[PDB]
Amino acid sequence: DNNFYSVEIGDSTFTVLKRYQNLKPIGSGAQGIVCAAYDAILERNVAIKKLSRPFQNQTHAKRAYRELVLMKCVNHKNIIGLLNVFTPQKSLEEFQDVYIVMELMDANLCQVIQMELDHERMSYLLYQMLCGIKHLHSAGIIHRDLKPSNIVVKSDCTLKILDFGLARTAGTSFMMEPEVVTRYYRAPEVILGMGYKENVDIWSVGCIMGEMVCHKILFPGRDYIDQWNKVIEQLGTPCPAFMKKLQPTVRNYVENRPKYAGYSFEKLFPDVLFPADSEHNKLKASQARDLLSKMLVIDASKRISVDEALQHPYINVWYDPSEAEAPPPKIPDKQLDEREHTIEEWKELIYKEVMDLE
C-alpha cells in the first residue's frame, strides 16, 4: 500500500497512483489500453493509457518513446495535453510499464459523424483539426494515423488531435505491423508503398470529412489490397504519370487492374448530404465539396497542402494567425535519433524519459 493501488481493467491490470480514481475503460487500441478516471489532486476527470507492451520489440519501443517525447514537446490548443506520465516499477531493472495521463474530452469524431451539423460547426471542427495538423507539419512531423477515433471533442465545440506513436518524419512508407493504421484511411501512397510527405495526412482529413458528410465510411474495403479497388472505383484509375512512380512489383499489378472512370464529386457528394445551405458564399456545400475534391486526390503531388487547406474559403472564415501560424514545436534531438537501438538500449531511453518526465 505505497503510492499505487491496482485494478482489473477488463482484461489487463492497471497499477496506478492513488490520485487517479474510478478508472473504467474507454478505448482498447493497437498501441494501448486507455481508461477514464478522476484525479483527486486536480479534481477533474483524466485519461490514462497503459502503453500495451512497450518492449516486445524494437518497433513498439520506438513507437512508445516517440509518443512520450512528442506528448511533451508538442503543445497547441488543438493537440491533446499531456498531464502526467509514470511507472509503478522501482528500478530500471524492474522497469516494465509506462502510464500516460492526459486530458479527457467528451467524445470521438465517431460521435460527431453520428449527427447532423451546420456549416459553422463542420467548417469550424475542420479548421481546428487542420490547425493541429499544421502545428505538427511545421516541425516536419507527420501524424500517419489520423482517423475518427484519434480526433476528440468537448461539448463547447473544441477539438484536439491525439495519438502520436506512429508520428514521424517524411521518407519511406515501409512500416512494421501496418495493421496498426486503420485501412479505410490509408493514403494511396501508403497503400502502394510509395514515399510520403506531409500531405499524406491531408488524404486522411479528406476521408474523414467525407465520412462526416456521408456518415458512412468513404472507401470501405475488405482487405489491404481491396482498399485500392475501392479508391479507384470512386476516384478513377490514376493517370500514367503516377503509375510510373510505383515500385516495379506494384506498378505492374496496378496497371492490370480494371479501368475506372470514377464518379464526379457531386454524385459522390450530393448537396443533400452537406449541411443546409444559407445565403453565405463561404459556408456553402459547394465550397466544402471543392475542398474535398482537393484532398481526395490520389497523386499526392497534386493534393492540397495543410497551408492551402487553411486558406480555403470554407475553412478560412476562422483563420487566426495565433492558431494557424503558431511558432513550431521544437524537439531536443531525441527524435532526430531515428536510429535503431536494441530492445535493451530502448528500455534505457524509455526509463530515462519516464523518470525525468514524472
Binding site: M115, E120, Y124, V153, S155, D156, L283
Partner: peptide, 10 residues
C-alpha cells in the same frame, strides 16, 4: 460569423 460555443454530443 462567430465561432460556435456548443456541440450537442448527446
Amino acid at each position: 460569423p462567430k465561432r460556435p460555443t456548443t456541440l450537442n454530443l448527446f
